[PDB]
Amino acid sequence: RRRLGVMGGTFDPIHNGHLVAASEVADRFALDEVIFVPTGQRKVSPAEHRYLMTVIATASNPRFTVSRADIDRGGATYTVDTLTDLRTAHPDADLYFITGADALASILSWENWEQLFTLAKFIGVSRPGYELSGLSLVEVPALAISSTDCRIRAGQARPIWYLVPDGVVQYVAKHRLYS
């Protein structure tokens, strides 16, 4: 069966932390594809901008794609809705939902994760400054990067080079996203 990575995120902006994590997981579980899924709509940049920055970010990687499913569904994004639609859209694939330590704790604490485990294999990945502890835990390269830090840098005219892809650096400057 086809092995599809899934990685949800606000992606405001997508950064090298998100991308290095997806790439490690893709290697360790021999995934054919990773679909990045921008969440639907602290100011959150419009959905279309977050979507496009994600297409630009993932463009160069032969295995990474983007779904606009969550942004098009409308309203709030729940993990169950994301995976169910992906199950319907890729009936013959095995889904691997990729999630960093903070968002994993949140799913385990606040969602019916037993149901979620019936829709996909869960791959919890490490993130600097958080505690990682049917579900698999993987250590990915330690890149202490948050979108928050990027948004603060962009607003203070401080550089986000080498924290996000060159495409995202350009895209943030051109559309003036966080100033």
Nearer to a copy of itself, 84 or 126 (CB): 126
- Which positions touch a copy of itself (CB under 8 A)? 16, 19-20, 23-24, 26-27, 60-61, 128, 141-145, 149, 158-159, 161-163, 165-166
CA distance 37 to 5: 10
Q: Which of a copy of itself, ligand ATP, none does residue 11 bind to, with CB < 5 to 8 Å depending on kind?
A: ligand ATP
Residue type, 161: W
Question: And the tokens for 85?
Answer: 């639609």
Q: Which of ligand ATP, a copy of itself, none does residue 175 bind to, with CB < 5 to 8 Å depending on kind?
A: none
CA distance 16 to 154: 16
- Which positions touch ligand ATP (CB under 6 A)? 9-11, 17-18, 21, 99-100, 102-103, 125, 127, 143, 145-148
Nearer to a copy of itself, 32 or 48 (CB): 32
Nearer to ligand ATP, 91 or 156 (CB): 156
Residue closest to ligand ATP (Cβ)? 100
Q: How far is the CB of 118 from ligand ATP (least distance, A)?
A: 20
Q: What are the angstrom distances between the C-alpha of 85 and each of 49, 56, 82, 131, 139? A: 22, 24, 6, 30, 28
Strand order in the sheet with 33-38: 64-66, 33-38, 2-9, 93-100, 121-125, 135-138
